[PDB]
Design a protein around this ligand. Structure first.
Ligand SMILES: CSc1ccc2c(c1)N(CC[C@H]1CCCCN1C)c1ccccc1S2
Length: 273
């Protein structure tokens, strides 16, 4: 049923997440994205409500794809002999946050506030659906350049949310928290806050704070760009070494620097058009 129902187009890239092609749904001419994932490479499996064995990524996507969110939705999927195939939304025009920052450099605080907020809502939604993304970073965040709306991709590293300790991590090293580096254990929310702490620094300074493990474990943040006494506070609080000294989402979202956030449409007018 696959090859008939959608119309494949260009490639859009590949990595440790598979190979994505542009594509159109014939039924409506919705833009979509088609993501092929080989079975032989899938490390992490699960089971859907009806009790079928699929890749975790699919489980997680289905859980977060109900109604609107800052999360690129799974519209459908297929199984093949050696691949799985996932149809996803394709916002148009779009750009990932890595390219954006690689182009425009560090972001004005007003713009970083808008983006960071949207990531926070998006991550709150995942956590609400029982999902931990486990790999939050610039290149896993897309920007719909017209509506000013950020959306969250790949879930390939990613787990069912749980309150006990995690001992695996197939994510991004430089975004990993000191507790993991040192002890090979961490807890979801606290770890996620850390990664957000890294995300926010990247946004305002145009590059990540830490390169090597020694730098992470040492937890000391040097600012290369002019950033507000207040943003620095929020970043540092998010990158506290002791997980228990990091903020909750509420606390992050009630932090002074997070107040008077621009809505997505006005963000695009001022900062993207
Ligand atoms: C653009 S449209 C679009 C819409 C939905 C997704 C994808 C692309 N990509 C991003 C492609 C890749 C391109 C090279 C630069 C790094 N990035 C991650 C993807 C990737 C990973 C998991 C899920 C997905 S779903």
């Amino acid at each position: 049923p696959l090859e008939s129902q959608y119309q494949v187009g260009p490639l859009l890239g590949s990595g440790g997440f598979g190979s994505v092609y542009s594509g159109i749904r014939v039924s409506d001419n919705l833009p979509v994205a088609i993501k092929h994932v080989e079975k032989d490479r899938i490390s992490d499996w699960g089971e859907l409500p009806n009790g079928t064995r699929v890749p975790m990524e699919v489980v997680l996507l289905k859980k977060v794809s109900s109604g609107f969110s800052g999360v690129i939705r799974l519209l459908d999927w297929f199984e093949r002999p050696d691949s799985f195939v996932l149809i996803l939304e394709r916002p148009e025009p779009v750009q990932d946050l890595f390219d954006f920052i690689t182009e425009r450099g560090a972001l004005q605080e007003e713009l970083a506030r808008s983006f960071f907020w949207q990531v926070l809502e998006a991550v709150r939604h995942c956590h609400n659906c029982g999902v931990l993304h486990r790999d939050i970073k610039d290149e896993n965040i897309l920007i719909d350049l017209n509506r000013g709306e950020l959306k969250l991709i790949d879930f390939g590293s990613g787990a069912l949310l749980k309150d006990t300790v995690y001992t695996d991590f197939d994510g991004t090293r430089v975004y990993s928290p000191p507790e993991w580096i040192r002890y090979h254990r961490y807890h979801g929310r606290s770890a996620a806050v850390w990664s957000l702490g890294i995300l926010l620094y990247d946004m305002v300074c145009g590059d990540i704070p830490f390169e090597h493990d020694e730098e992470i474990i040492r937890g000391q943040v040097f600012f290369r760009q002019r950033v507000s006494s207040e943003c620095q506070h929020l970043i540092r609080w998010c990158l506290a070494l002791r997980p228990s000294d990091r903020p909750t989402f509420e606390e992050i979202q009630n932090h002074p620097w997070m107040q008077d956030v621009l809505l997505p449409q006005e963000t695009a007018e001022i900062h993207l058009h």
